[PDB]
Amino acid sequence: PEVFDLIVIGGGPGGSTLASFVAMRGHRVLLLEREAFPRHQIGESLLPATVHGICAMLGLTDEMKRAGFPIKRGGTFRWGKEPEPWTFGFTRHPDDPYGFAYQVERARFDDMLLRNSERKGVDVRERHEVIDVLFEGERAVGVRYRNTEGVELMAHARFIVDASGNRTRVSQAVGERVYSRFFQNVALYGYFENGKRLPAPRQGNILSAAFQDGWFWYIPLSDTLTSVGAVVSREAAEAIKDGHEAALLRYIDRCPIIKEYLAPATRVTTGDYGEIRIRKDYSYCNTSFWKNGMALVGDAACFVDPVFSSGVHLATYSALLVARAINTCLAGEMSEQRCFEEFERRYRREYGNFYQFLVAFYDMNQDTDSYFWSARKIINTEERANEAFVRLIAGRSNLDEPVFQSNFMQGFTREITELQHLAMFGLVPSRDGLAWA
Numbered sequence: 001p002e003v004f005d006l007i008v009i010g011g012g013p014g015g016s017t018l019a020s021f022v023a024m025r026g027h028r029v030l031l032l033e034r035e036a037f038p039r040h041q042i043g044e045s046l047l048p049a050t051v052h053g054i055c056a057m058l059g060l061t062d063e064m065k066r067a068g069f070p071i072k073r074g075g076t077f078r079w080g081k082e083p084e085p086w087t088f089g090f091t092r093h094p095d096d097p098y099g100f101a102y103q104v105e106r107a108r109f110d111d112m113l114l115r116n117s118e119r120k121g122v123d124v125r126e127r128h129e130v131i132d133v134l135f136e137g138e139r140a141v142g143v144r145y146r147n148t149e150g151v152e153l154m155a156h157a158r159f160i161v162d163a164s165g166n167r168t169r170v171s172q173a174v175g176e177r178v179y180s181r182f183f184q185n186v187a188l189y190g191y192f193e194n195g196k197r198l199p200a201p202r203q204g205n206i207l208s209a210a211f212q213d214g215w216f217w218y219i220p221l222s223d224t225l226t227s228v229g230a231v232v233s234r235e236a237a238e239a240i241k242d243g244h245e246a247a248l249l250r251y252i253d254r255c256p257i258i259k260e261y262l263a264p265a266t267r268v269t270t271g272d273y274g275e276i277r278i279r280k281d282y283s284y285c286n287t288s289f290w291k292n293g294m295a296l297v298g299d300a301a302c303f304v305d306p307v308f309s310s311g312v313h314l315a316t317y318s319a320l321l322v323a324r325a326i327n328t329c330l331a332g333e334m335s336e337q338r339c340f341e342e343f344e345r346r347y348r349r350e351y352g353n354f355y356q357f358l359v360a361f362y363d364m365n366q367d368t369d370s371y372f373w374s375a376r377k378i379i380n381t382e383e384r385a386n387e388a389f390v391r392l393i394a395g396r397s398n399l400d401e402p403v404f405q406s407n408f409m410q411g412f413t414r415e416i417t418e419l420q421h422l423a424m425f426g427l428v429p430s431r432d433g434l435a436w437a
């Protein structure tokens, strides 16, 4: 049974990124991926930190350029108080640092990434499904898998990392997955050909649009292809079944901007983009991201919600953080505890930043007759007590007098909240950036 420095379970952006970064330091890594690449996965809109930070460190800048991925300068939102769409840009000027990102076909993007792993020296093996992580001495020491044929084998390493995404079958070995009560949403999504684009030089921007029952994303993948998804209540899903296509089509009709952008369009009916998928119970965090010899990265560890497109960034950032722990420990410096505690602290900080901001962002949409939006509001009480206090001591307690009248990780249990509080409170990289100094 083969011996490695690291075994990575899953070859999406989390797994391939971590594998590459440790192999780049000259270590033995195996990466097992259940599927044969290329394969469809949701998660198409990217951020500059991944495009200009991660992908540059991986040495993929040039290959990204040549791919023909639409260039994402920011996004447009129909969201909040006003009906008119507003826009954001990553930077004030088009070409200054971290100025843009891409809208990617994940099949091609992940494949591109996994191929780069190989070339970086990673032993990647497709059609290989991990079944169990193996423990000895209270430490993760290997995995059981099935290879390309039905054959059950084993492999061993000093470190085992679950990068196997939301359907991980091994994460419970590290911690308990705890679902957010706030982001209790289901996404229903398909692909459309020949749909319209945003104006100006913004054709490649993501568009997200709120309507009465939730919100839509609208991501251009090429001149002809658009990813389109409705994010609605979990409760609505339990009645979209036996009628996937009809549910989405009816949702499209009920969102003006999406209705108009898809009027010229035909839905893809064949291939990987001809299906309409559902994702449910996607918002969660684990009670722990590492134990002893094992770590969780990407969707295996935690996920917030698709608005503002943070998933691939989180996966790739956590991959870098784990890579640094592994590259620093395999060099006999520091300790496993110091390095993996730093990993979890940093990861929870970035996850927490997005969680907090997205709760407030959901809260800012005004739609007073929407059940969906009314149930996705910041739960205050203490601010309302404060406001009443302040009204009183300003001389304004009389609300009938016209002369005078002219929290944290919401939706989570205490355990997640406390872990997040410690990490956020409400080490520096080596010159290489591949380990800790």
Ligand SMILES: Cc1cc2nc3c(=O)[nH]c(=O)nc-3n(C[C@H](O)[C@H](O)[C@H](O)COP(=O)(O)OP(=O)(O)OC[C@H]3O[C@@H](n4cnc5c(N)ncnc54)[C@H](O)[C@@H]3O)c2cc1C
Binding pocket: 009, 010, 011, 012, 013, 014, 015, 032, 033, 034, 035, 041, 042, 043, 044, 045, 046, 128, 129, 130, 131, 163, 164, 165, 166, 167, 168, 169, 187, 229, 279, 282, 297, 298, 299, 300, 303, 306, 309, 310, 311, 312, 313, 315
């Ligand atoms: C509705 C929806 C919309 C989203 N939109 C965006 C977006 O616009 N932008 C963005 O950045 N993110 C988006 N995300 C999130 C994004 O999908 C994920 O965050 C991202 O794919 C995480 O990558 P990963 O490497 O951790 O996992 P994955 O991409 O899921 O890859 C894990 C890999 O592990 C493999 N695997 C599974 N089990 C095993 C096993 N037993 N053994 C071996 N291999 C296994 C799988 O085949 C897969 O290839 C969205 C998510 C949802 C739910």
Ligand SMILES: [Cl-]
Binding pocket: 305, 306, 307, 308, 309, 310, 311, 312
């Ligand atoms: Cl996301």
